[PDB]
Write a protein that binds this ligand. Sequence first.
Ligand SMILES: NC[C@@H]1O[C@H](O[C@H]2[C@@H](O)[C@H](O[C@@H]3[C@@H](O)[C@H](N)C[C@H](N)[C@H]3O[C@H]3O[C@H](CO)[C@@H](O)[C@H](O)[C@H]3N)O[C@@H]2CO)[C@H](N)[C@@H](O)[C@@H]1O
Ligand SMILES: [Mg+2]
Ligand SMILES: [Mg+2]
Ligand SMILES: [Mg+2]
Ligand SMILES: [Mg+2]
Ligand SMILES: [Mg+2]
Ligand SMILES: [Mg+2]
Ligand SMILES: [Mg+2]
Ligand SMILES: [Mg+2]
Ligand SMILES: [Mg+2]
Ligand SMILES: [Mg+2]
Ligand SMILES: [Mg+2]
Ligand SMILES: [Mg+2]
Ligand SMILES: [Mg+2]
Ligand SMILES: [Mg+2]
Ligand SMILES: [Mg+2]
Ligand SMILES: [Mg+2]
Ligand SMILES: [Mg+2]
Ligand SMILES: [Mg+2]
Ligand SMILES: [Mg+2]
Ligand SMILES: [Mg+2]
Ligand SMILES: [Mg+2]
Ligand SMILES: [Mg+2]
Ligand SMILES: [Mg+2]
Ligand SMILES: [Mg+2]
Ligand SMILES: [Mg+2]
Ligand SMILES: [Mg+2]
Ligand SMILES: [Mg+2]
Ligand SMILES: [Mg+2]
Ligand SMILES: [Mg+2]
Ligand SMILES: [Mg+2]
Ligand SMILES: [Mg+2]
Ligand SMILES: [Mg+2]
Ligand SMILES: [Mg+2]
Ligand SMILES: [Mg+2]
Ligand SMILES: [Mg+2]
Ligand SMILES: [Mg+2]
Ligand SMILES: [Mg+2]
Ligand SMILES: [Mg+2]
Ligand SMILES: [Mg+2]
Ligand SMILES: [Mg+2]
Ligand SMILES: [Mg+2]
Ligand SMILES: [Mg+2]
Ligand SMILES: [Mg+2]
Ligand SMILES: [Mg+2]
Ligand SMILES: [Mg+2]
Ligand SMILES: [Mg+2]
Ligand SMILES: [Mg+2]
Ligand SMILES: [Mg+2]
Ligand SMILES: [Mg+2]
Ligand SMILES: [Mg+2]
Ligand SMILES: [Mg+2]
Ligand SMILES: [Mg+2]
Ligand SMILES: [Mg+2]
Ligand SMILES: [Mg+2]
Ligand SMILES: [Mg+2]
Ligand SMILES: [Mg+2]
Ligand SMILES: [Mg+2]
Ligand SMILES: [Mg+2]
Lengths: 125, 138
Amino acid sequence: PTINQLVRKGREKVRKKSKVPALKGAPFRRGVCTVVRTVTPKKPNSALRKVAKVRLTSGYEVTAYIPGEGHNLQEHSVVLIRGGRVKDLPGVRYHIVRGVYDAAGVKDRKKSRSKYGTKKPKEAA
Amino acid sequence: MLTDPIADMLTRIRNATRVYKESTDVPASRFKEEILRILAREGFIKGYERVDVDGKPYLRVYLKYGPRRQGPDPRPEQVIHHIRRISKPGRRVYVGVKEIPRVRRGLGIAILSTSKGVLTDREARKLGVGGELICEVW
RNA sequence: GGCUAAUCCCCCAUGUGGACCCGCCCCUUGGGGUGUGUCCAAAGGGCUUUGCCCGCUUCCGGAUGGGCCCGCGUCCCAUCAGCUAGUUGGUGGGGUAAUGGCCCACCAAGGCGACGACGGGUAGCCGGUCUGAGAGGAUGGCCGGCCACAGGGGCACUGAGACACGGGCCCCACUCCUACGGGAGGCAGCAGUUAGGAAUCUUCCGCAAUGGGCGCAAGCCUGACGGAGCGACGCCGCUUGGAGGAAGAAGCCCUUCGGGGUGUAAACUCCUGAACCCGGGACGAAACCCCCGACGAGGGGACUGACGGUACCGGGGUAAUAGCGCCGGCCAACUCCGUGCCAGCAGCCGCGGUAAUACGGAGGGCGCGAGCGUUACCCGGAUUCACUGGGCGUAAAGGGCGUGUAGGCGGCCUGGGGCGUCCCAUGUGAAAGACCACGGCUCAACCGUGGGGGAGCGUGGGAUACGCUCAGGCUAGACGGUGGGAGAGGGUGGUGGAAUUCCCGGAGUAGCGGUGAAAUGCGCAGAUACCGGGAGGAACGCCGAUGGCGAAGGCAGCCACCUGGUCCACCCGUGACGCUGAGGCGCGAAAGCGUGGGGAGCAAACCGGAUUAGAUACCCGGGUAGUCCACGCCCUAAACGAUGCGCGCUAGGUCUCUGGGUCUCCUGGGGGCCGAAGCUAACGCGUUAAGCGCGCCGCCUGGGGAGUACGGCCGCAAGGC
RNA sequence: UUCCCGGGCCUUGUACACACCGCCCGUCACGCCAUGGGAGCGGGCUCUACCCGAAGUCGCCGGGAGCCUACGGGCAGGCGCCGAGGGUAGGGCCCGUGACUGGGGCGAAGUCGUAACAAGGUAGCUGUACCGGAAGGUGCGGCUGGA
RNA sequence: GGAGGUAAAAAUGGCAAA
Ligand SMILES: NC[C@@H]1O[C@H](O[C@H]2[C@@H](O)[C@H](O[C@@H]3[C@@H](O)[C@H](N)C[C@H](N)[C@H]3O[C@H]3O[C@H](CO)[C@@H](O)[C@H](O)[C@H]3N)O[C@@H]2CO)[C@H](N)[C@@H](O)[C@@H]1O
Ligand SMILES: [Mg+2]
Ligand SMILES: [Mg+2]
Ligand SMILES: [Mg+2]
Ligand SMILES: [Mg+2]
Ligand SMILES: [Mg+2]
Ligand SMILES: [Mg+2]
Ligand SMILES: [Mg+2]
Ligand SMILES: [Mg+2]
Ligand SMILES: [Mg+2]
Ligand SMILES: [Mg+2]
Ligand SMILES: [Mg+2]
Ligand SMILES: [Mg+2]
Ligand SMILES: [Mg+2]
Ligand SMILES: [Mg+2]
Ligand SMILES: [Mg+2]
Ligand SMILES: [Mg+2]
Ligand SMILES: [Mg+2]
Ligand SMILES: [Mg+2]
Ligand SMILES: [Mg+2]
Ligand SMILES: [Mg+2]
Ligand SMILES: [Mg+2]
Ligand SMILES: [Mg+2]
Ligand SMILES: [Mg+2]
Ligand SMILES: [Mg+2]
Ligand SMILES: [Mg+2]
Ligand SMILES: [Mg+2]
Ligand SMILES: [Mg+2]
Ligand SMILES: [Mg+2]
Ligand SMILES: [Mg+2]
Ligand SMILES: [Mg+2]
Ligand SMILES: [Mg+2]
Ligand SMILES: [Mg+2]
Ligand SMILES: [Mg+2]
Ligand SMILES: [Mg+2]
Ligand SMILES: [Mg+2]
Ligand SMILES: [Mg+2]
Ligand SMILES: [Mg+2]
Ligand SMILES: [Mg+2]
Ligand SMILES: [Mg+2]
Ligand SMILES: [Mg+2]
Ligand SMILES: [Mg+2]
Ligand SMILES: [Mg+2]
Ligand SMILES: [Mg+2]
Ligand SMILES: [Mg+2]
Ligand SMILES: [Mg+2]
Ligand SMILES: [Mg+2]
Ligand SMILES: [Mg+2]
Ligand SMILES: [Mg+2]
Ligand SMILES: [Mg+2]
Ligand SMILES: [Mg+2]
Ligand SMILES: [Mg+2]
Ligand SMILES: [Mg+2]
Ligand SMILES: [Mg+2]
Ligand SMILES: [Mg+2]
Ligand SMILES: [Mg+2]
Ligand SMILES: [Mg+2]
Ligand SMILES: [Mg+2]
Ligand SMILES: [Mg+2]
């Protein structure tokens, strides 16, 4: 546009929107599960992904993904929301930190145990 | 209506160099006459003269171009590779002696009107004045 | 109730001086001086004592700190467009150290706002910090400057200064003590408790230092501070050895089984030596104090350390923690096994459905290392808000079109000012940080010293090319005159013929319409086809075109009236009068709405007949609004050249419309085609640019949701913006 | 050589490219979620008018009534204006909720049709109006993004 | 010889993937 049009109107800042409404953008958020289940993903894939409706401290109720293989989550389980969505599950935008307050780590995990919360096993080595 | 008579001159020059014309006609102005005085000393033209067209004074700016290259596309290289107005009437550009640009690492010229007259970048830093940055030619 | 002392309170005096009224003078907003009148002062204490010291009083001056005012700058929402009663201004008062509607009476009716008032959301601001090539974007944590607060809210008192965190009063909420009647309290100080939360410390030591308060001093107080303690929270420094070591053990992994990999890794051999143990042991400390000199200058002596026996120095002396991410591409690092669209991975594209370098494990590899990954946020990449530095024919995007307010911009010459702009000098731009050198901790992080500068703004002086302004002038822009030209430009009024349908008369008969094939339908009640006559509405064949006109929508028989735009010539006048144009205003196809008229043909909806699996459609036969007229509304479009307007420049060739000429041909305007250069992503554009420029306006910022919902305006509604 | 099937070349159209045994549109059934409307309900903030109104400054009295150290004065006390807030009454914006409802987005293999892309078998799109289970058909005018 | 311009037929193809 012209210079005079830019003195009058100006330039609009983009001001990006959040993809994580965790109420003040905290890194984590404690929440209790309400309904834990399995759903079906989008069209290119097909499996039974474990999901969980979590009643967080902020008053809302959001679906959360359980990572790894196997868990110990129930109707009265306390979890910790991490963030990050699942591409194949529409409606799932958060993740559950394993290894905290009620969600035990992936049993018999050996490689990437920083994620999925599993301690260092000690077999004389 | 000629909102800017200076850019019409520089565009008449630019339009006459792409067709390799001998000369072109720009209207008369004592300020454009001083701008063309700088284009002649630095070597972008041959000169001008206060001609008269139907009782109206114009300026026959004689052009100048490079050697006739061989091979494909035999048109010669331009002596004016680039010319454009900076301080347009919509946005007047005013500069000082510290903020003078290095037009093509000194291989170009920066004409700018000062209180000491129509000078250029190398003459502005020598006298120490600066002013309205008119145009860049290279 | 009663004594009682002072640096407590008061009265009288003295008045250098000061305050106030009035007059005069200088200046010139209440600054300074002067004269008359009036008013105002005050404290004592200690010693080597009729001599100093600490204090007191009044006035002037310095230095510091602060009050008020002004210029400029300071987030988003216009789906917030009007706001204003102490509101705006004056007069006189009150109040304050001091102006002011700060407050009060009276008068005048003003003040602010698209340069965004008012309102709504959010936020303490800065020096700086983070990023970035830069411009900018984001931020205000530690430190420093200013502010605002002290459970929420109001208020004053004392005082140089407070509307006062650890002072007072009152109201509310809450906690606590009660003899129940009326009392106590305010950790957003230092620690600490609880709550909330993903998450954030020790109820530590000391006034040794520096700083603050009091005091002549001695000294007292300081959770200010100096330090210690917790936490990989960040950065920096360091350790888990080092040199040897077999053509190369065991174990494990792969194997085309011949071998290769881990792997000079290990064991082993030398060597040094974290930790640890012993002894010593700080800098930070020198003043205040005392003595000589006069308790001055100068000189001399002594006291004092939390950290801390700590860093550190010397001697001795042990082989002494390694972990995390990744290995499809981006992206550095590959093989075996399991699993079989299961379990699962995932930042993007995407892997997995029997042999997966993408899941899980193992081997091996890569990357970093007391760290490594993840999640959230900021900048970057993002030149995807483009000032540097983007765009709109077809990808997102030119307003349907004009006229025009403000605004932005504006031709040639010569003068005056010097506002923009430019230079020089000066002042400011605190420190810290950052940057460059040199130092101090054994380096670095950290810290000290010095140096260097931005911009911005105030003052003085200069320059006058460009922008602005004032004045004079000029004609190339623009407008006007004179004479003519073409056109479906617009409105009104009248009018011509062909044809369709209907009615009437004559004539005449067994079928007519209709499909792409047939029915419905019409017709012996006399149809179709033919002649004559009449009514009525609508549209104007040939001319007619790839044509003309208008800003667009759009405009076609003919006549006349009213009327607009435009073109050429003559070069006569005005003389820069210009271009664009947010808002507004007006026009705006078709369909649609209201009110009345009209209704021949056509024809949404509707009903038949066919087709069809079905037909709410395509085809056929009927047919109502509508189409048409008058006025008022509606305001849309593939309102398209999907190209806003104005001016200047840049090769031509050819067809056509319309003027002018000394009319072979030239030149002005307009409608087409092909194409120099050039542009473009390509198609294509190309003097009627999508080229090269400049001015102004509208618009764009991934798709769906959506031109939707809410709010606002408009409308009779439909619906529009 | 008109017509069925297959093939060759040229050209044209394409939304097809695991390529017409292609693609693709809407209604319906199911599930998840977000949003609008909705008899209304609950909450925050804010505004206008009024009633009462502590502390306290200031203004008047200071007397049929006190205290006083210099008394045509002071203090106590009393009155009035202002006043934190409380109360009542009507509004304004915003947030949350609500039986039910409208359309929407998403979710591998459900039903019904064949609208579009090839003259897509009725050239398509488009503005408006009417109708129809639905994509959609028809009317009037327009467009070339068609012959 | 330049405009005008010649349909009677007919629905569909489960999902994802070199
Ligand atoms: N997606 C946009 C919207 O989709 C609408 O379509 C929606 C429905 O019409 C459509 O339903 C389709 C159906 O058309 C088709 N005939 C069968 C198909 N199985 C259905 O599919 C749907 O349902 C199944 C479960 O039943 C879901 O797993 C699947 O994800 C979903 N697409 O699924 C769509 C939503 O996924 C319309 N096309 C239109 O309004 C609009 O374009
Ligand atoms: Mg005197
Ligand atoms: Mg006296
Ligand atoms: Mg705040
Ligand atoms: Mg950049
Ligand atoms: Mg508190
Ligand atoms: Mg006082
Ligand atoms: Mg205090
Ligand atoms: Mg306190
Ligand atoms: Mg907690
Ligand atoms: Mg101290
Ligand atoms: Mg001290
Ligand atoms: Mg081995
Ligand atoms: Mg010492
Ligand atoms: Mg690689
Ligand atoms: Mg396998
Ligand atoms: Mg991977
Ligand atoms: Mg693997
Ligand atoms: Mg950027
Ligand atoms: Mg980014
Ligand atoms: Mg830009
Ligand atoms: Mg772009
Ligand atoms: Mg487009
Ligand atoms: Mg104007
Ligand atoms: Mg000018
Ligand atoms: Mg000036
Ligand atoms: Mg500084
Ligand atoms: Mg420094
Ligand atoms: Mg003349
Ligand atoms: Mg003039
Ligand atoms: Mg105009
Ligand atoms: Mg209309
Ligand atoms: Mg109409
Ligand atoms: Mg009508
Ligand atoms: Mg009526
Ligand atoms: Mg009919
Ligand atoms: Mg059929
Ligand atoms: Mg019909
Ligand atoms: Mg068109
Ligand atoms: Mg325009
Ligand atoms: Mg247009
Ligand atoms: Mg032409
Ligand atoms: Mg062409
Ligand atoms: Mg609409
Ligand atoms: Mg052949
Ligand atoms: Mg073909
Ligand atoms: Mg609702
Ligand atoms: Mg008296
Ligand atoms: Mg509600
Ligand atoms: Mg709903
Ligand atoms: Mg079809
Ligand atoms: Mg069709
Ligand atoms: Mg169709
Ligand atoms: Mg239509
Ligand atoms: Mg129909
Ligand atoms: Mg079907
Ligand atoms: Mg098919
Ligand atoms: Mg299929
Ligand atoms: Mg699949």
